[PDB]
Amino acid sequence: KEEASSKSYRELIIEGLTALKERKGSSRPALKKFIKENYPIVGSASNFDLYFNNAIKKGVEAGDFEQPKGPAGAVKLAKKKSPEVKKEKEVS
């Protein structure tokens, strides 16, 4: 709005993660690019690459994102804690 930041990664990730899901979901690097191309505000933010990882972690604990391929893999928009997601090791 004025500051060159203060974009919620929650919005940014979901905006993409819902779109670039393809087969079902997509890895962080793909989302990171999506945000950089679409939301330069945060995309070109210092240590955005690092912040994004924490954002994913924050989102998955919040039950807003979920990683089918376990932590540090592909993320998928979480809507229901449905079965056949037993490749996350310990995202809990």
Tokens matching residue 35 = 């945000």
CA 24/CA 18 separation, integer angstroms: 9
> 34: domain CATH number?
1.10.10.10
Q: What domain range is 87 assigned to?
A: 1-92
Method: NMR
For the chain, give the secondary structure using H, E and C.
Answer: CCCCCCCCHHHHHHHHHCCCCCCCCEEHHHHHHHHHHHCHHHHCCCCHHHHHHHHHHHHHHHCCEECCCCCCCEEEECCCCCCCCCCCCCCC
Look up tokens 């793909």; give the residue: 30
Counting the structural domains of the chain, the total is: 1
**Distance between CA 91 and CA 58 in Å, rounded?**
11
